[PDB]
Amino acid sequence: ILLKNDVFMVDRYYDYYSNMGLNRFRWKNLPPGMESRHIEQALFNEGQAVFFKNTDPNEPYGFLCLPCAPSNGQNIYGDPVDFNGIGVNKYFTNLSPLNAVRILDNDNGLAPVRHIAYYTYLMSQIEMTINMNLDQQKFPIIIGATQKNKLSMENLYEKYSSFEPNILVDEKLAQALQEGKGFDALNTQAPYLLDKLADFKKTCENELLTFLGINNSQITFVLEMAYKNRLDACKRINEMFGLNLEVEKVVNLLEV
Amino acid sequence: ILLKNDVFMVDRYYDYYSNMGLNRFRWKNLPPGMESRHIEQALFNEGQAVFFKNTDPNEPYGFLCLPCAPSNGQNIYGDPVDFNGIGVNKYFTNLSPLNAVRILDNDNGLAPVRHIAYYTYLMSQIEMTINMNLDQQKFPIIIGATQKNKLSMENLYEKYSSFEPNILVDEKLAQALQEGKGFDALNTQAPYLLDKLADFKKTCENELLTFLGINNSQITFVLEMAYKNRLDACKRINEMFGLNLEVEKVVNLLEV
Amino acid sequence: ILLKNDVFMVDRYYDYYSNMGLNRFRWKNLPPGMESRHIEQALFNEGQAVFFKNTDPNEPYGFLCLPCAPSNGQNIYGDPVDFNGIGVNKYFTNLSPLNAVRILDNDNGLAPVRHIAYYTYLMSQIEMTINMNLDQQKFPIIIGATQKNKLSMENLYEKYSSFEPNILVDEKLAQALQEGKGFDALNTQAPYLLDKLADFKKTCENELLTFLGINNSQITFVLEMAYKNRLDACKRINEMFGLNLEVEKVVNLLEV
C-alpha cells in the first residue's frame, strides 16, 4: 500500500463483508476435531458442502464436511447421482446419496461470495472516483502566460498567498507576434460530487446486505430459506449417522 | 468473472429470484421417493406438469410428476386429448385424462420463469449503465496541448496533485503555424445518474414480485389463482389414485 | 512543521484514531510483567497474536503475547500447522496449536490499522484542499496594465484601501501599438467550498468509526464479532495454562 494514486482497497471490503456473511448461523453439537466455522465456510464459498465419514487413515478425522463438486450424471428430475469432496491438498472420489449428505446454502447452490465479489469491485471504484474528484477541486482554473508575465504574477502572489499560483508558460503565446493577450485563463472546474458519492456507497451497502439476508420482508425471507435448507440437512445427518447435530440463527454472537 | 468492463451478472439475479419463485407452495403427503420441490420445479419451469403411475421397470419410482407437453389434437372446447411427460434423458408417450392428471400453475399455463428471464436481462443492463456512468465521472474535461506545453502542465500538477492531469498531445495543435492557442479544453462532462438508476432497479424488482404474486389486491389475487389450480389438481390425484396429497401456501418456511 | 503550504497532518489523525481503536477491550487478570495494552496492540496492528510460555532465559518473562505470522503449511480446512511470534529485536520459531494459542481480532485476521491508514490519507487531502480553496478566495480578479497605468491605479487605492491592488504589468499590453485597452481584467474567481469540505470530513469520520465498531445494528454487530473471538481465545488460554484471564468491553474507561 502507500503508493501515489492507488490503494489496496479490495481487501478492506472483502474481508469485512466476509466476516458478516460467515456469522449468520451456528452449529452446536459436532464430531471430534470439527468446528462450526468449517461447515459455514464451505457453504459460504461454494454454496454447497458434503458431510461424510472418513476412510483414509492418514487424515486425523472421524467425519469431514467439505465443499462439494457433483458428477455430471443425474436422475429423471436432474438430481446428481454422485458427490465429490474437495479439500486443501486433497480430493475424495465419488461419494453417494446412500453414504453422504449434501448440504445447500440455498436451493440453486448459489455461493454467497459471488455477491460480495461484485460489490467489493464496485465500492473500490467509488473510492477511486471520490479521490480523483477531490484532487480535481484544487485546480478550477489554469493560467497560460509569457515567461516574463509568469514571473510578474509569482511576485503578486508572494505578497499575500500561502501557495504558488496555477500558472505556466505557453510556448505559442510566448512565440507569436501581433494579437494574443500574454495571459489566457482556461476553465478546468470539475463538478462537486463528494456528498453524492458517499450516498451511493451507502445505497450499495444496503443492496449487498439484502442479498445476504443480514439487514424487511425480503430480508427475512432470504434468511428463512437459508435456515430451512440447514434444518433439512441437519435431520438427514442425524438419521444417517446418529450424531445429534443442531443448527441455529445468530440473533446475538454471545449467548449471555 | 473478474474481467475488465464485464461481470457474470445474469446468474446472481436469475438464481436469487428463482429461489423465491420455487418457495410459494408446499406439498405435504407424497408417494415414496418423491419431494415437494420436484412438483414445484415442473410448475415453475414449464407452467404445467403431468402426474402418473410409472410402468417402465428400469426406473425406481412408483409415481412420477414431470413437465407436460400436450399433443396437437383437442375436443370441441380446445382441451388436449393426450399428454406427454418429459424427463431428463427420458420421454413418456401419450398419457391421457383417463389415466393421468395435468396440473397447471395458472389457467393459461404461462411459466413463471418467463417473467424472471425478462427482468434478469433488464437488471443486468441497469448494472452495466451504473458502471459506465460511474467511470465517466472521472473525466469531466480533457486538455489538448503541444508536446512542450504538456510537459509544463505535468510539472504544475506534480507540486500538489495525487494523480496525473487529463492532458494529451494534439497533432493538429502541435503542427499548425499562426493562430490556435497551444492548449484547448474539450468538455466531456456526463450527467450524474447513480441515484436515479438505483431507484429504477428497485421499481423493476417490485414489478417482478407482483407478476410472481410474492410481495396488494392484485398480488393476493395472483397467488389465490395459483393456489386454486393446485387444490383442484390435488383432489383429482386423490380421487384417481387414493394418495391423500395436500398442498399449502408458505406463509413461513419453518413451521415452528 | 511550520513550513509554507504544508503541514505534518498525518500524525494528528493517525495517533488520535489509534488511541480510540486501542481502547475497545480490557484484559483483567494477567501473568507477571504483562499489561492489557500489550495484547491489544498486537491485535490492533497485525490482526492476530500468539500467546505462549517463554523458554529463552535471557528474556525476563514467564509468558509472552506477540503479533503472529503463520507458516505456509495447512490442514484439509486451511488452518495453518505452526505459528511464529514476532518481537522487537526478537523472533520465536515455529510454535504450534499443541503448545500456544492464536488470538484473532476478527475471523479473517484483518488488522484494524488498515482502516485508519486509508482514512488518515483521505483526511490529510481534505485539509490540503480546504487550505488551497481558502487561499484562492483572496484573488477573484487580476488586472493586467501598462507600467504607467499600474502606477496610476496604486494611487487610486492608496486613498481609501488597506491593501495593495491585484495589478501587474502585461508586456504584450505595454509593447503593442494600435488596439488593446491598456487595462484588462482576467476573472480568476474559484467556487466557495469550505462549508461542503467540512461536511465531507465529518462523513468520512463516521465511516471510519463504523469499520472500528466504535460509534447502529452494523456497529454493534462489528463489536460483537470482535468480542466473541476474544472470549473464545480467553477460555483456550485458561484451559492450556490455568491462568484465569478475563476480557471485557470498555463501556467507560474508569470503573467508578
Author numbering:
A (entry chain B), B (entry chain A), C (entry chain C): 28 to 242, 261 to 301
Task: Tell me, in the authors' exact words, what the paper reports.
The phiCPV4 phage belongs to the Guelinviridae family and infects Clostridium perfringens, a pathogenic scourge of the poultry industry, which causes foodborne illnesses in humans. Guelinviridae infecting Clostridium species also cluster together (in yellow) with the phiCPV4 PP (gp17) sharing 28.7% sequence identity with phi29 gp10. The height and diameter the phiCPV4 gp17 dodecamer are 82 Å and 158Å. In phiCPV4 gp17 the N-terminus could be traced from residue Val23 and forms the α1 helix similar to that of phi29 gp10 and GA1 gp10. Likewise, monomers of phiCPV4 gp17 are held together by 4 hydrogen bonds between the α3 helices: Gln152A, Tyr145A, Lys165B, Asn158B, where A and B designate adjacent subunits. Interestingly, in phiCPV4 gp17 the β-sheet of the clip is formed by three strands β8, β9, and β10 of the same subunit. In phiCPV4 the inter-monomeric interactions occur between α4 (Asn176B, Met180B, Leu183B, Tyr184B) and β9 (Leu195A, Val196A, Glu198A) of the adjacent subunit. The insertion of the Lys-Leu-Ala-Glu-Ala motif (residues 197–202 forming helix α4′) followed by the loop Gln-Ala-Leu-Gln-Glu, makes the link between β9 and β10 bigger, allowing them to form a common β-layer. The inter-monomeric interactions are located between β9 and α4 in phiCPV4 gp17, which is different from all other PPs; while in phi29 and GA1 gp10 it is the β8 and β9 from adjacent subunits that make the more typical inter-monomeric interactions. This is an unexpected observation, since all other Caudovirales PPs described to date have the β-sheet of the clip domain formed by strands from adjacent subunits.
The Portal Protein (PP) complex is a central component of Caudovirales virions in the process of self-assembly of phages. The PP has multiple functions: (1) as a nucleation point for capsid formation; (2) as part of the motor for loading the genome into the capsid; (3) as a head-full sensor; and (4) as a conduit for genome translocation. All portal protein primary structures are characterised by a common fold comprising four conserved domains: The capsid-facing C-terminal crown, the interior wing and stem, and the tail-facing clip domains. Using cryoEM, we determined the structures of two portal proteins: GA1 gp10, and phiCPV4 gp17, which are phages of the Salasmaviridae and Guelinviridae families respectively. Both GA1 gp10 and phiCPV4 gp17 PPs have the canonical fold and domain organisation found in the portal protein phi29 gp10.
